[PDB]
Amino acid sequence: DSKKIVGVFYKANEYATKNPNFLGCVENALGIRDWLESQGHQYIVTDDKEGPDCELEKHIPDLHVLISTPFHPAYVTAERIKKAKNLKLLLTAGIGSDHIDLQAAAAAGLTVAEVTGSNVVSVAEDELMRILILMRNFVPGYNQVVKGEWNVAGIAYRAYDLEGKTIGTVGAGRIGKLLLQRLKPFGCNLLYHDRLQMAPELEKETGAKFVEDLNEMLPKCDVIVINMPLTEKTRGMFNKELIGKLKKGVLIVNNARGAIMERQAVVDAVESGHIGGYSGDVWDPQPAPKDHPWRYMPNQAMTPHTSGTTIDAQLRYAAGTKDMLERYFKGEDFPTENYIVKDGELAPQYR
Amino acid sequence: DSKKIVGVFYKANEYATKNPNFLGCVENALGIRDWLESQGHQYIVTDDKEGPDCELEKHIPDLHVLISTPFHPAYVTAERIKKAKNLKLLLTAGIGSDHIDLQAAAAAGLTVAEVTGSNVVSVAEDELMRILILMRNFVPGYNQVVKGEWNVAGIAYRAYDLEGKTIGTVGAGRIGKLLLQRLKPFGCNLLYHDRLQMAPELEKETGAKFVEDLNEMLPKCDVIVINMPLTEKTRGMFNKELIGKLKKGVLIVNNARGAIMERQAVVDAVESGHIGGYSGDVWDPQPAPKDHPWRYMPNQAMTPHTSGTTIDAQLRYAAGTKDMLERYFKGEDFPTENYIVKDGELAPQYR
Numbered sequence: 001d002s003k004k005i006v007g008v009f010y011k012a013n014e015y016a017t018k019n020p021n022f023l024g025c026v027e028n029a030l031g032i033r034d035w036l037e038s039q040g041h042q043y044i045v046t047d048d049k050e051g052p053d054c055e056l057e058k059h060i061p062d063l064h065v066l067i068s069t070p071f072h073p074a075y076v077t078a079e080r081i082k083k084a085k086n087l088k089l090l091l092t093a094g095i096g097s098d099h100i101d102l103q104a105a106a107a108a109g110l111t112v113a114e115v116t117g118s119n120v121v122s123v124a125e126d127e128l129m130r131i132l133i134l135m136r137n138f139v140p141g142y143n144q145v146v147k148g149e150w151n152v153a154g155i156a157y158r159a160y161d162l163e164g165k166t167i168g169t170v171g172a173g174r175i176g177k178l179l180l181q182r183l184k185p186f187g188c189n190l191l192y193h194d195r196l197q198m199a200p201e202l203e204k205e206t207g208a209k210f211v212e213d214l215n216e217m218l219p220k221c222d223v224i225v226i227n228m229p230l231t232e233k234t235r236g237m238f239n240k241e242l243i244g245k246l247k248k249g250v251l252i253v254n255n256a257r258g259a260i261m262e263r264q265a266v267v268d269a270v271e272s273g274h275i276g277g278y279s280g281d282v283w284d285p286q287p288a289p290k291d292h293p294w295r296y297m298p299n300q301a302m303t304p305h306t307s308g309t310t311i312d313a314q315l316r317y318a319a320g321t322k323d324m325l326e327r328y329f330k331g332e333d334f335p336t337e338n339y340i341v342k343d344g345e346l347a348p349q350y351r
Numbered sequence: 352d353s354k355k356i357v358g359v360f361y362k363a364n365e366y367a368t369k370n371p372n373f374l375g376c377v378e379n380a381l382g383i384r385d386w387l388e389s390q391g392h393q394y395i396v397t398d399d400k401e402g403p404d405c406e407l408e409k410h411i412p413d414l415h416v417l418i419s420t421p422f423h424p425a426y427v428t429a430e431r432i433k434k435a436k437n438l439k440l441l442l443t444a445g446i447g448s449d450h451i452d453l454q455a456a457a458a459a460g461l462t463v464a465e466v467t468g469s470n471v472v473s474v475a476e477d478e479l480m481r482i483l484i485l486m487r488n489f490v491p492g493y494n495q496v497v498k499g500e501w502n503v504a505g506i507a508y509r510a511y512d513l514e515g516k517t518i519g520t521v522g523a524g525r526i527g528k529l530l531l532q533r534l535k536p537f538g539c540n541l542l543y544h545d546r547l548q549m550a551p552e553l554e555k556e557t558g559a560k561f562v563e564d565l566n567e568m569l570p571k572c573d574v575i576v577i578n579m580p581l582t583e584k585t586r587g588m589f590n591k592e593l594i595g596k597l598k599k600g601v602l603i604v605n606n607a608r609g610a611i612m613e614r615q616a617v618v619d620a621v622e623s624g625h626i627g628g629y630s631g632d633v634w635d636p637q638p639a640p641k642d643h644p645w646r647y648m649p650n651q652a653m654t655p656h657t658s659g660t661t662i663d664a665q666l667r668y669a670a671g672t673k674d675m676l677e678r679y680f681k682g683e684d685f686p687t688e689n690y691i692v693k694d695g696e697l698a699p700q701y702r
């Protein structure tokens with residue numbers, strides 16, 4: 001009954017011990033090493049995930065379970081899945097399992113699951129933060145401060161209050177709903193697009209108006225927020241043509257997945273001023289290389305992939321990961337909303 | 352009965368024309384020049400405000416009305432008031448009139464008024480954006496992006512969700528109340544201190560609790576927000592001893608006035624880790640010199656003085672300044688809430 005379990009996390013070095021609940025890094029490995037080893041399982045943890053000769057690849061031929069995390073994602077390709085002779089279970093410590101080839105996982109009969117709900121508040125907070133950072137023009141003020149400069153006009157000419165502006169969320173699942181709730185008291189005109197309409201009473205509490213056809217919402221928005229998974233349909237959806245339909249000077253927030261946008265289409269439209277500003281924590285690929293052009297374009301307010309891995313989020317997704325492992329050892333089903341691929345079927349929000 | 356009117360604003364140069372509503376700079380000067388010249392008055396506008404030899408000091412001897420603005424503040428000292436033989440009226444385009452020597456103004460019988468309520472939503476927004484930026488640790492992420500780095504752990508060890516944290520506002524007048532209303536859906540433990548308690552219905556809607564004694568509220572707070580005027584009592588109030596009563600690792604937001612804090616006492620407690628981070632738009636003095644130490648201390652999330660001068664704020668304070676000039680010319684009283692010094696008496700919020 002003893003299994004080989006591999007975890008792939010970001011490496012913390014001297015940061016590992018600066019908070020007692022820092023469960024998300026390599027060194028602390030979700031807090032589950034002792035619990036796993038006491039049951040006779042082998043637990044191997046690494047950040048070394050790229051290429052033929054990395055530590056992860058050493059263990060791909062015989063691991064049983066692979067625990068990944070979106071902030072430092074192991075890319076589980078069709079070729080890796082074919083090499084993986086004993087693999088049965090792919091767990092995501094966090095939310096969003098698109099770093100796996102989900103079609104090849106379904107074709108191989110693998111189970112893919114994630115900790116649904118675990119960091120959705122955290123991302124909704126970070127999104128509202130970035131809307132404010134772009135609208136109110138925080139980044140150019142910070143840059144003046146560190147360079148020893150002082151020029152209020154260089155900031156004020158394009159700074160605005162959020163009050164009275166039109167904000168559209170593209171996707172209204174768990175995160176989009178939590179965002180709409182936090183935006184209610186700012187006094188904005190809220191719109192949303194999804195394949196699924198929110199309940200009548202949630203529309204009434206938030207004041208948010210359903211727009212069934214995405215192309216009708218886009219031109220109306222001063223602010224657009226991305227809030228869908230990375231799926232075969234959403235991949236590359238914000239291309240040259242779709243971005244042309246946005247209001248001139250639109251501010252875009254994207255803490256969903258970087259690859260929902262076409263990389264170069266965003267760069268070109270930022271340089272022309274057609275996108276007024278772009279802010280998010282997600283990139284294609286991750287880690288983002290040193291030369292990734294989103295780092296250097298005008299008006300950018302980016303960070304690395306951090307919003308779903310606050311300390312409070314880490315505690316919840318480590319706990320959910322442990323619960324699923326415990327269920328797995330006992331042959332019990334996970335909560336239904338956790339499955340992304342089960343019995344060869346993809347979950348509806350990814351179809 | 353035609354008057355010399357002087358305006359002191361920040362200079363925009365090429366930025367002036369980038370927005371048709373950019374009324375807060377020298378070049379557009381609240382949009383009132385034609386209006387004032389058509390009535391036979393003279394309107395001298397300048398940003399040059401420092402020392403014996405600046406353009407402002409040339410007009411001090413014979414001006415009738417001086418319009419100042421907090422973002423680029425003319426320091427109207429006792430020595431200046433004495434030299435000002437014709438001066439009758441000091442108007443603040445924005446909110447907070449502490450850049451005037453208010454005791455010398457009272458002594459000389461000068462009227463001091465400002466545009467109450469004009470940018471209070473704007474600052475409430477900017478405060479909440481800063482709580483998020485400090486709590487969720489945005490600034491180190493931005494810094495890594497522009498330097499070409501990628502290290503998630505270096506940000507995540509210190510990042511938390513705002514949900515469930517304790518936040519205290521020191522002051523609950525116009526801005527403090529608007530902040531509390533916007534914090535409500537984040538699910539925090541909200542406390543406030545003021546000399547005046549809020550209406551019970553407002554306490555209930557926001558969920559904020561009155562703490563009558565300031566010293567009792569302070570050690571309880573993860574986040575402290577400064578929300579009072581700069582007055583004889585608030586000036587230097589956050590000194591070595593008062594900062595010591597704060598929780599270790601406290602995050603502080605101050606978009607009120609810089610001099611409410613002792614400058615070096617903030618530097619020391621930030622260097623020690625007693626203050627975990629400090630964020631605001633306001634400084635002593637302004638413009639802040641190149642070597643001001645708040646620009647360079649650990650964890651700082653500063654900007655120049657911007658939050659009360661968004662485009663939407665400028666439209667409101669330009670209109671309120673124009674309205675008080677019209678009343679002035681007709682011998683009519685300003686709205687009661689606009690007066691800071693009238694008949695040699697300070698307004699109650701400054702006492």
Ligand SMILES: NC(=O)c1ccc[n+]([C@@H]2O[C@H](COP(=O)([O-])OP(=O)(O)OC[C@H]3O[C@@H](n4cnc5c(N)ncnc54)[C@H](O)[C@@H]3O)[C@@H](O)[C@H]2O)c1
Pocket residue numbers: 094095096097117119120123171172173174175176193194195196227228229230231233234255256257281282305306307308309349350351
């Ligand atoms: N930055 C972070 O740290 C972080 C953390 C968590 C999640 N995320 C990303 O955000 C995503 C959303 O999270 P959630 O909890 O809100 O997910 P959710 O499943 O609850 O909501 C997704 C929504 O997308 C809609 N949708 C799917 N395909 C669509 C399409 N083609 N057109 C229109 N609507 C479509 C679905 O109907 C659903 O309401 C995750 O999949 C993940 O990729 C990022």
Ligand SMILES: NC(=O)c1ccc[n+]([C@@H]2O[C@H](COP(=O)([O-])OP(=O)(O)OC[C@H]3O[C@@H](n4cnc5c(N)ncnc54)[C@H](O)[C@@H]3O)[C@@H](O)[C@H]2O)c1
Pocket residue numbers: 445446447448468470471474522523524525526527544545546547578579580581582584585606607608632633656657658659660700701702
């Ligand atoms: N950063 C900006 O752009 C910007 C913009 C507007 C205002 N401000 C600053 O914010 C201040 C507050 O603005 P407002 O509209 O909320 O003012 P307000 O008059 O409505 O509120 C001031 C509050 O301070 C309280 N107070 C005064 N002295 C006190 C003391 N010693 N102890 C406890 N409470 C005390 C009063 O009871 C009052 O409720 C302004 O005076 C200004 O200096 C900054």
